[PDB]
């Protein structure tokens, strides 16, 4: 699950730190600068058929 | 509110022209004559202070560009010099800039009991010019062994570069500061 | 090329006629460290990739997509050349560009301009 | 004598008219004895002047304490096209220092003659006097003295009618304490930001405008023309062997009548305080700590203020410094932690921010000192102060980082029980509240 | 021995005939001895931290990565 | 042994070539080389933040401090000239402790924004902090901050991450030739900026992204797009002009 | 029994022409031999009284494309009687 | 209100008044459950945006 702040803003900052640690390469992230200039993801998709549910 | 960057305002902006004067050109020539002609940049401080006195106690961005043209360097160097040194006012100070709050050696004898009385007397915060445009409050650079702790520095910009005077007043009472300010308002200058 | 090892290795004959580039990767411009230098790599020029028309993933049909970047590394140009020669790959060698250490002194920041010349 | 070091007669003083009772202009200078047979001194050769300075054993009065004659001997002897410069460092900005101001506003012609003599002794073609920016009136007085000297022929082309061509100029800063350092002064005088240079290029080889130059204090320059005239043997007969002469002291702080006075180089601190100035406020028992030589030098507690000699070497052996010799007497009626935190704030404010250890370490020291000013720290924070001061020292470009670290080390070395006591009482008041 | 196995008391069962029945009996005895070792580990387990203090090789605490610069750098580099 | 990065030392003459001991190893360097360059010849790579081989020397960061036998205090190897018979020491406790002290000072007011920094996996500050730095931070007080300024459509600016190495200023003054950037202010409050709202108009202005060791200066079009570890590097030449 | 004893004993007892590289460390006492002396070395180390190595733990290969002899074959050995481990390595190419 | 994107939702939160020149944003009341500490300088006229939360902080008086 992807969480968001209580204000309604998504917490993901497109740091790709989860994509680099994923031992199964199940995460693909695409990011760009939003209209406000904030670092956010455009595409964040997880392969649940590659996921090994390790919690890394 | 000392900021290391400039926001364009009606008071100061690069579009406004700024030459020195007819009377101040001889001073510029004399200042430049002290250094070799290939090292005109060495006369940036004695020219910046002259611009500060002439303009009225503060340096608009136009004055810095004029000084840069006179010494023939990039204006960023003059900005670097102006922002580094603490005697160059980049915000608009009052006609009689008053320097009050002390330093380390001078507060042992009680130099931190003088700013608030004047601040509430003239009724505008530090770095804020009064409505009539006469007085301002700033932080002094204590100069000596400071035997008499309550010292106030009075920078005078009433007559420009011809009547600019920088005095230190020793042992001034938190009400004697009001006395000397009232004397300054009329026009008379107190002795030291 | 005596690509006998290529014949007794198991690589398919289609991939044994590839053209590769032997080169030493240079230091990145965003870092001043020189730790990832001195190693030689074989570039298979594997550019045939496309986009998956279901999720936008990068698809490929080239087995040598990342072998030369991931596992195949050599400590010298001679080792890479011998490897390519034994595997029967047509190779070209790109000699690395190396910096030249010039004389630089701190006192050069403060150098006399010379006597004022009214030229 | 050797056993009793201290006590100068009125005749043996160098800086007459130090109190401003007489005319400081050219008339008073010639009647007092300035510009007296200066042509003879210049016409005796550059080498003779350096020899006399070396014999007199004049150590630097700017705080470093380096011998003046050996410093002047470092200047090039053969010109290779680069003119030699002399720079007089009048930009005194140390808190509680009043010496160079009093010299420039009461004896300007002593300074001018000293500049001429030093330029002759270093083969310098011009002299720049760098005055502190706040000394506007002193700058005007010295400029008037310069005009009088030029009008009388004592300076300029054929100075004193001796064939030497010496030009004296008056530059001034704009309110920076770092600009007093040798290389930062050269940067400021070159029209740039007053940020010190790195030392491997020395000023004697690449200084002002990339030309060889020498930066000297006003006091060292001012006493030069009278050492030659009176005699080095007379000058060397004051103070101990290695460090000799007469030096000005601006005594301030908790003393009855603070003043500036000239005394032998080896005056005892107790005798100095209790002889010229009055006794310490509340008596010598009220004494708690004395700053020996101004802000830069560390602190000295009372137990070792007894039988201490105000020398360059004696104070250094007590892990302190003579510095500018501007003592700051502190009583038991003052919080030492507050004073040291204020020194830390001063050094945070005056750091030029060029190198990493001083730009950040000074601020960190100030914040920790502010926290301990009210005991809002743990007992293990003092060790962190020691570690941070040791990290700052020795890694900075100039000596302001060392000057910023020394007061904290002095506070920890001699007043650790006070810091622990205030920390403990703060902890007790926190525990007994909730 | 590795870890704290040399501070624990347990027996090593040994067969006599080598058949499948001895294997089964030894597999029973080993599991009983593992129960014994578990009891000893529960009784003697001390207090303290659960990782090496060299944060160059182990992750920082989630409260320290969000409060200290070097802890955040270590977290980034490790992950 | 070989020089770091395969650097080629050009000896104009064999006569003018001093000898130094970087770590007990005899090294021959021309007269004029610095201690850092002599170490580079001897295969030892000294940490650096403000030193660039194409820019003038300015010993600001104090990160390249080493030990010299005839020196009471550590010397900045980037600016100290090499002398004949000089014995350098790099791995000694003095140089080490200096390096951790300097790293601790540098990481004191640095913002905790590695995840959102475009210099994430390619930062010299964190790479050297892992290698030559310490493990635990003793700093707990409030950090400083500065506002961000617009330098144009090419250079994205986050000056909270500035370490004040002045490499951008030196590049603008020397290589670019357009003097519009400089260090403004004094002390910890000093800032890099152009003072008057102006944009970097130099055709070589984009090179300040590379010379910046931290994420203070980053590319604006290539903002947040990808991390360096995701990118395959191809060594190609230019076709925009005839310089190649 | 231990790495300090096995190293010296095999230095003295073993024929010199077999082993060409001996490492004695805490990571493991290794022997490097030519491929034509491997069988002889292991037969010696399996039958000698003071080096009774009777368990072959595993055989693994390591790939070094930068070497002339590309593959490194490692023989991890165990001696139950003396509670010691010995590693023997050789090198061979593809043919 | 799924029609509102997170950008519009974070653009509707009024800026937080801060008296000082600098504010520290952690992202949540409990520090351990938010984002890394972020110090924001309020020396401009426009509100200052946190680069993690998107929350805007504006200086109160001067
Ligand atoms: C931060 C700093 C400030 C200094 N300020 C002064 C000063 O105001 N006056 C002075 O004579 N020396 C000052 N010095 C010492 C200078 O290095 C001085 O020019 C040098 O010691 C020569 O002094 P001398 O004339 O006694 O030989 C300062 C040094 C530092 C590091
Ligand atoms: S990219 Fe992954 S690790 Fe980074 S903030 Fe988003 S979910 Fe977390
Ligand atoms: S120690 Fe401080 S004053 Fe001296 S150069 Fe470094 S930052 Fe500037
Ligand atoms: S500049 Fe480097 S250390 Fe600083 S936030 Fe960016 S990646 Fe992290
Ligand atoms: S912006 Fe980058 S290159 Fe410029 S001084 Fe700051 S850290 Fe150095
Ligand atoms: S308190 Fe300002 S001159 Fe002393
Ligand atoms: S690289 Fe030498 S001090 Fe910065
Ligand atoms: Zn936030």
CSV table of N, CA, C and O in Angstrom, one decimal, chain B residues 30 33-36 39 41-46 49 53 77 80-81 83-88 103-105 107-109 112 139 141-147 164-168 192, chain D residues 95-98 101 128 132-137 143 146 169 171-176 178-179 188-195 209 250 252-255 258 342-343 346 349-350 352:
chain,number,residue,atom,x,y,z
B,30,UNK,N,41.3,62.0,-6.5
B,30,UNK,CA,42.3,61.9,-5.5
B,30,UNK,C,42.4,60.5,-4.9
B,30,UNK,O,43.5,60.0,-4.7
B,33,UNK,N,44.2,58.3,-7.4
B,33,UNK,CA,45.6,58.6,-7.6
B,33,UNK,C,46.5,57.9,-6.6
B,33,UNK,O,47.7,57.9,-6.8
B,34,UNK,N,46.0,57.2,-5.5
B,34,UNK,CA,46.8,56.6,-4.5
B,34,UNK,C,47.2,55.2,-4.9
B,34,UNK,O,48.1,54.6,-4.2
B,35,UNK,N,46.7,54.6,-6.0
B,35,UNK,CA,47.0,53.3,-6.4
B,35,UNK,C,47.4,53.3,-7.9
B,35,UNK,O,47.0,54.1,-8.6
B,36,UNK,N,48.2,52.3,-8.3
B,36,UNK,CA,48.6,52.2,-9.7
B,36,UNK,C,47.4,52.1,-10.6
B,36,UNK,O,46.4,51.4,-10.2
B,39,UNK,N,45.7,48.9,-11.1
B,39,UNK,CA,45.1,48.3,-9.9
B,39,UNK,C,44.1,49.2,-9.3
B,39,UNK,O,44.0,49.5,-8.1
B,41,UNK,N,41.0,48.6,-8.9
B,41,UNK,CA,40.1,47.9,-8.0
B,41,UNK,C,40.5,48.1,-6.5
B,41,UNK,O,39.6,47.9,-5.6
B,42,UNK,N,41.7,48.4,-6.2
B,42,UNK,CA,42.2,48.7,-4.8
B,42,UNK,C,41.5,49.8,-4.2
B,42,UNK,O,41.5,50.0,-2.9
B,43,UNK,N,40.8,50.7,-4.9
B,43,UNK,CA,40.1,51.8,-4.4
B,43,UNK,C,38.6,51.6,-4.4
B,43,UNK,O,37.8,52.5,-4.7
B,44,UNK,N,38.1,50.4,-4.0
B,44,UNK,CA,36.7,50.1,-4.0
B,44,UNK,C,36.1,50.5,-2.7
B,44,UNK,O,35.0,51.0,-2.7
B,45,UNK,N,36.8,50.4,-1.6
B,45,UNK,CA,36.2,50.7,-0.3
B,45,UNK,C,36.2,52.3,-0.1
B,45,UNK,O,35.2,52.8,0.4
B,46,UNK,N,37.3,53.0,-0.4
B,46,UNK,CA,37.2,54.5,-0.2
B,46,UNK,C,36.3,55.1,-1.3
B,46,UNK,O,36.0,56.3,-1.2
B,49,UNK,N,32.4,54.0,0.4
B,49,UNK,CA,32.0,54.8,1.5
B,49,UNK,C,31.7,56.2,1.1
B,49,UNK,O,30.8,56.8,1.6
B,53,UNK,N,28.2,58.1,1.9
B,53,UNK,CA,28.1,59.4,2.4
B,53,UNK,C,27.2,60.3,1.5
B,53,UNK,O,26.3,61.1,2.0
B,77,UNK,N,31.9,42.0,-8.1
B,77,UNK,CA,33.0,42.2,-7.2
B,77,UNK,C,32.6,43.3,-6.2
B,77,UNK,O,32.9,43.2,-5.0
B,80,UNK,N,30.2,41.9,-3.8
B,80,UNK,CA,30.9,41.1,-2.8
B,80,UNK,C,31.6,41.9,-1.7
B,80,UNK,O,31.5,41.6,-0.5
B,81,UNK,N,32.2,43.0,-2.1
B,81,UNK,CA,32.8,43.9,-1.2
B,81,UNK,C,31.8,44.6,-0.3
B,81,UNK,O,32.0,44.6,1.0
B,83,UNK,N,28.7,43.6,0.6
B,83,UNK,CA,28.0,42.7,1.5
B,83,UNK,C,28.9,42.2,2.6
B,83,UNK,O,28.5,41.9,3.7
B,84,UNK,N,30.3,42.1,2.3
B,84,UNK,CA,31.2,41.6,3.3
B,84,UNK,C,31.4,42.5,4.5
B,84,UNK,O,31.4,42.0,5.6
B,85,UNK,N,31.6,43.8,4.2
B,85,UNK,CA,31.9,44.7,5.3
B,85,UNK,C,30.7,45.3,6.0
B,85,UNK,O,29.7,45.5,5.3
B,86,UNK,N,30.8,45.5,7.3
B,86,UNK,CA,29.7,45.9,8.1
B,86,UNK,C,29.4,47.4,8.2
B,86,UNK,O,28.4,47.8,8.8
B,87,UNK,N,30.3,48.2,7.7
B,87,UNK,CA,30.0,49.7,7.7
B,87,UNK,C,29.3,50.1,6.4
B,87,UNK,O,29.0,51.3,6.3
B,88,UNK,N,28.9,49.2,5.5
B,88,UNK,CA,28.2,49.6,4.3
B,88,UNK,C,26.7,49.2,4.5
B,88,UNK,O,26.4,48.0,4.7
B,103,UNK,N,29.1,45.2,22.9
B,103,UNK,CA,29.8,44.0,22.5
B,103,UNK,C,30.2,43.3,23.8
B,103,UNK,O,29.6,43.6,24.9
B,104,UNK,N,31.2,42.4,23.8
B,104,UNK,CA,31.6,41.6,24.9
B,104,UNK,C,32.2,42.5,26.0
B,104,UNK,O,31.7,42.6,27.1
B,105,UNK,N,33.4,43.2,25.8
B,105,UNK,CA,34.1,43.8,27.0
B,105,UNK,C,33.3,44.9,27.6
B,105,UNK,O,33.4,45.2,28.8
B,107,UNK,N,29.9,45.2,28.1
B,107,UNK,CA,28.7,44.9,28.8
B,107,UNK,C,28.9,44.6,30.2
B,107,UNK,O,28.0,44.6,31.0
B,108,UNK,N,30.2,44.2,30.6
B,108,UNK,CA,30.5,43.9,32.0
B,108,UNK,C,30.2,45.2,32.8
B,108,UNK,O,29.7,45.1,33.9
B,109,UNK,N,30.5,46.4,32.3
B,109,UNK,CA,30.2,47.6,32.9
B,109,UNK,C,28.8,48.1,32.6
B,109,UNK,O,28.5,49.3,32.9
B,112,UNK,N,24.4,46.9,27.9
B,112,UNK,CA,23.2,46.3,27.4
B,112,UNK,C,22.0,46.9,28.1
B,112,UNK,O,21.0,46.1,28.3
B,139,UNK,N,23.7,48.3,15.2
B,139,UNK,CA,24.6,47.6,16.1
B,139,UNK,C,26.0,48.2,15.8
B,139,UNK,O,26.5,48.3,14.7
B,141,UNK,N,30.2,48.8,16.3
B,141,UNK,CA,31.5,48.1,16.5
B,141,UNK,C,32.3,48.8,17.5
B,141,UNK,O,32.9,49.9,17.2
B,142,UNK,N,32.3,48.3,18.7
B,142,UNK,CA,33.0,49.0,19.8
B,142,UNK,C,34.5,49.1,19.5
B,142,UNK,O,35.1,48.1,19.1
B,143,UNK,N,35.0,50.3,19.7
B,143,UNK,CA,36.3,50.6,19.2
B,143,UNK,C,37.5,50.5,20.2
B,143,UNK,O,38.6,50.2,19.7
B,144,UNK,N,37.2,50.8,21.4
B,144,UNK,CA,38.4,50.8,22.4
B,144,UNK,C,38.2,49.9,23.6
B,144,UNK,O,37.4,49.0,23.6
B,145,UNK,N,39.0,50.2,24.6
B,145,UNK,CA,38.9,49.4,25.9
B,145,UNK,C,37.6,49.7,26.6
B,145,UNK,O,37.3,48.9,27.5
B,146,UNK,N,36.9,50.7,26.2
B,146,UNK,CA,35.5,50.9,26.6
B,146,UNK,C,35.4,51.0,28.1
B,146,UNK,O,34.7,50.3,28.8
B,147,UNK,N,36.1,52.0,28.7
B,147,UNK,CA,36.0,52.3,30.1
B,147,UNK,C,34.6,52.7,30.5
B,147,UNK,O,34.1,52.2,31.6
B,164,UNK,N,29.5,64.8,6.8
B,164,UNK,CA,29.5,63.5,7.4
B,164,UNK,C,30.5,63.4,8.5
B,164,UNK,O,31.7,63.7,8.4
B,165,UNK,N,30.0,63.0,9.7
B,165,UNK,CA,30.8,62.9,10.9
B,165,UNK,C,30.5,61.7,11.6
B,165,UNK,O,29.3,61.3,11.7
B,166,UNK,N,31.5,61.0,12.2
B,166,UNK,CA,31.3,59.7,12.8
B,166,UNK,C,31.9,59.8,14.3
B,166,UNK,O,33.1,59.7,14.4
B,167,UNK,N,31.0,60.0,15.3
B,167,UNK,CA,31.5,60.3,16.6
B,167,UNK,C,31.1,59.2,17.6
B,167,UNK,O,30.1,58.4,17.4
B,168,UNK,N,31.9,59.0,18.6
B,168,UNK,CA,31.6,58.1,19.7
B,168,UNK,C,31.4,59.0,21.0
B,168,UNK,O,32.2,59.8,21.3
B,192,UNK,N,31.7,65.7,22.7
B,192,UNK,CA,32.2,64.4,23.2
B,192,UNK,C,33.6,64.6,23.9
B,192,UNK,O,34.4,65.4,23.4
D,95,UNK,N,38.5,43.3,20.8
D,95,UNK,CA,37.8,44.0,21.9
D,95,UNK,C,38.7,44.4,23.0
D,95,UNK,O,39.6,43.6,23.4
D,96,UNK,N,38.4,45.5,23.6
D,96,UNK,CA,39.3,46.0,24.7
D,96,UNK,C,40.7,46.4,24.3
D,96,UNK,O,41.6,46.1,25.1
D,97,UNK,N,40.9,46.9,23.1
D,97,UNK,CA,42.2,47.4,22.7
D,97,UNK,C,42.2,48.8,22.3
D,97,UNK,O,41.3,49.3,21.6
D,98,UNK,N,43.1,49.6,22.9
D,98,UNK,CA,43.1,51.1,22.7
D,98,UNK,C,44.4,51.7,22.4
D,98,UNK,O,44.6,52.9,22.5
D,101,UNK,N,45.0,53.4,18.3
D,101,UNK,CA,44.2,54.6,18.3
D,101,UNK,C,44.8,55.7,19.0
D,101,UNK,O,44.9,56.9,18.5
D,128,UNK,N,51.7,51.9,2.8
D,128,UNK,CA,50.3,52.0,3.0
D,128,UNK,C,49.9,51.8,4.4
D,128,UNK,O,50.2,50.7,5.0
D,132,UNK,N,41.8,51.3,10.7
D,132,UNK,CA,40.4,50.8,10.9
D,132,UNK,C,39.4,51.8,10.5
D,132,UNK,O,39.5,53.0,10.6
D,133,UNK,N,38.3,51.3,9.8
D,133,UNK,CA,37.3,52.1,9.3
D,133,UNK,C,36.6,53.0,10.3
D,133,UNK,O,36.2,54.1,10.0
D,134,UNK,N,36.4,52.5,11.5
D,134,UNK,CA,35.7,53.3,12.5
D,134,UNK,C,36.5,54.5,13.0
D,134,UNK,O,35.9,55.4,13.6
D,135,UNK,N,37.8,54.5,12.8
D,135,UNK,CA,38.6,55.6,13.3
D,135,UNK,C,38.6,56.7,12.2
D,135,UNK,O,39.6,57.0,11.5
D,136,UNK,N,37.5,57.3,12.0
D,136,UNK,CA,37.3,58.4,11.1
D,136,UNK,C,38.1,59.6,11.5
D,136,UNK,O,38.9,60.2,10.7
D,137,UNK,N,37.9,60.0,12.8
D,137,UNK,CA,38.7,61.2,13.3
D,137,UNK,C,40.2,61.0,13.3
D,137,UNK,O,40.9,61.9,12.9
D,143,UNK,N,45.8,62.0,8.2
D,143,UNK,CA,45.9,62.6,6.9
D,143,UNK,C,46.4,64.0,7.0
D,143,UNK,O,47.2,64.5,6.1
D,146,UNK,N,50.0,63.8,7.5
D,146,UNK,CA,50.7,63.4,6.2
D,146,UNK,C,50.8,64.6,5.3
D,146,UNK,O,51.9,64.8,4.7
D,169,UNK,N,50.8,56.3,1.9
D,169,UNK,CA,49.4,56.4,1.6
D,169,UNK,C,48.6,55.9,2.8
D,169,UNK,O,49.1,55.1,3.6
D,171,UNK,N,45.2,54.0,3.4
D,171,UNK,CA,44.0,53.2,3.1
D,171,UNK,C,43.3,52.9,4.4
D,171,UNK,O,43.8,53.0,5.5
D,172,UNK,N,42.0,52.5,4.3
D,172,UNK,CA,41.2,52.2,5.5
D,172,UNK,C,40.2,51.2,5.2
D,172,UNK,O,39.7,51.1,4.1
D,173,UNK,N,39.9,50.4,6.2
D,173,UNK,CA,38.9,49.3,6.1
D,173,UNK,C,37.5,49.8,6.2
D,173,UNK,O,37.2,51.0,6.3
D,174,UNK,N,36.6,48.8,6.3
D,174,UNK,CA,35.1,49.1,6.4
D,174,UNK,C,34.5,48.3,7.4
D,174,UNK,O,33.3,47.8,7.2
D,175,UNK,N,35.1,48.0,8.5
D,175,UNK,CA,34.5,47.4,9.7
D,175,UNK,C,34.6,45.8,9.6
D,175,UNK,O,33.5,45.2,9.6
D,176,UNK,N,35.8,45.3,9.5
D,176,UNK,CA,35.9,43.8,9.6
D,176,UNK,C,37.1,43.5,10.5
D,176,UNK,O,38.2,44.1,10.3
D,178,UNK,N,38.5,40.5,10.8
D,178,UNK,CA,39.5,39.6,10.1
D,178,UNK,C,40.5,40.4,9.3
D,178,UNK,O,41.5,39.9,9.0
D,179,UNK,N,40.2,41.6,8.9
D,179,UNK,CA,41.0,42.4,8.0
D,179,UNK,C,42.3,42.8,8.7
D,179,UNK,O,43.2,43.3,8.0
D,188,UNK,N,42.1,43.0,1.5
D,188,UNK,CA,41.3,44.2,1.6
D,188,UNK,C,41.9,45.4,0.9
D,188,UNK,O,41.2,46.1,0.2
D,189,UNK,N,43.2,45.5,1.0
D,189,UNK,CA,43.9,46.6,0.4
D,189,UNK,C,44.0,46.4,-1.1
D,189,UNK,O,44.2,47.4,-1.9
D,190,UNK,N,43.9,45.2,-1.6
D,190,UNK,CA,43.8,44.9,-3.1
D,190,UNK,C,42.5,45.1,-3.7
D,190,UNK,O,42.3,45.0,-4.9
D,191,UNK,N,41.5,45.5,-2.8
D,191,UNK,CA,40.1,45.8,-3.3
D,191,UNK,C,39.2,44.6,-3.3
D,191,UNK,O,38.2,44.6,-4.0
D,192,UNK,N,39.6,43.5,-2.7
D,192,UNK,CA,38.8,42.3,-2.6
D,192,UNK,C,38.2,42.1,-1.2
D,192,UNK,O,38.4,42.9,-0.3
D,193,UNK,N,37.6,40.9,-1.0
D,193,UNK,CA,37.1,40.6,0.3
D,193,UNK,C,38.2,40.3,1.2
D,193,UNK,O,39.2,39.6,0.8
D,194,UNK,N,38.1,40.7,2.5
D,194,UNK,CA,39.2,40.5,3.4
D,194,UNK,C,39.3,39.1,3.9
D,194,UNK,O,39.0,38.8,5.1
D,195,UNK,N,39.7,38.1,3.1
D,195,UNK,CA,39.8,36.7,3.4
D,195,UNK,C,41.3,36.3,3.4
D,195,UNK,O,41.9,36.5,2.4
D,209,UNK,N,49.8,43.2,-4.3
D,209,UNK,CA,49.9,43.2,-5.8
D,209,UNK,C,50.8,42.2,-6.3
D,209,UNK,O,51.4,42.4,-7.4
D,250,UNK,N,46.8,48.5,27.8
D,250,UNK,CA,45.5,49.1,27.9
D,250,UNK,C,44.7,48.3,29.0
D,250,UNK,O,44.0,47.3,28.7
D,252,UNK,N,42.0,47.3,31.5
D,252,UNK,CA,40.5,47.6,31.6
D,252,UNK,C,39.9,46.6,32.5
D,252,UNK,O,40.6,45.8,33.2
D,253,UNK,N,38.6,46.5,32.5
D,253,UNK,CA,37.9,45.6,33.3
D,253,UNK,C,37.6,46.0,34.8
D,253,UNK,O,37.6,47.2,35.1
D,254,UNK,N,37.5,45.1,35.7
D,254,UNK,CA,37.3,45.4,37.1
D,254,UNK,C,38.6,45.8,37.8
D,254,UNK,O,39.2,45.0,38.5
D,255,UNK,N,39.0,47.0,37.4
D,255,UNK,CA,40.1,47.6,38.1
D,255,UNK,C,39.6,49.0,38.5
D,255,UNK,O,38.7,49.6,37.9
D,258,UNK,N,41.0,52.1,35.3
D,258,UNK,CA,41.5,51.6,34.1
D,258,UNK,C,42.2,52.7,33.2
D,258,UNK,O,41.6,53.8,33.2
D,342,UNK,N,30.1,34.9,25.3
D,342,UNK,CA,30.1,36.2,24.6
D,342,UNK,C,31.4,36.3,23.6
D,342,UNK,O,31.3,36.8,22.5
D,343,UNK,N,32.5,35.8,24.1
D,343,UNK,CA,33.7,35.7,23.2
D,343,UNK,C,33.4,34.8,22.1
D,343,UNK,O,33.8,35.1,20.9
D,346,UNK,N,31.3,36.6,19.6
D,346,UNK,CA,32.1,37.6,18.9
D,346,UNK,C,33.0,36.9,17.8
D,346,UNK,O,33.1,37.5,16.7
D,349,UNK,N,30.7,36.0,15.0
D,349,UNK,CA,30.3,37.1,14.2
D,349,UNK,C,31.4,37.6,13.3
D,349,UNK,O,31.2,38.2,12.2
D,350,UNK,N,32.7,37.5,13.7
D,350,UNK,CA,33.8,38.1,13.0
D,350,UNK,C,34.5,37.1,12.1
D,350,UNK,O,35.5,37.5,11.4
D,352,UNK,N,35.3,35.1,8.9
D,352,UNK,CA,35.0,35.5,7.5
D,352,UNK,C,34.3,34.3,6.7
D,352,UNK,O,33.8,34.5,5.6
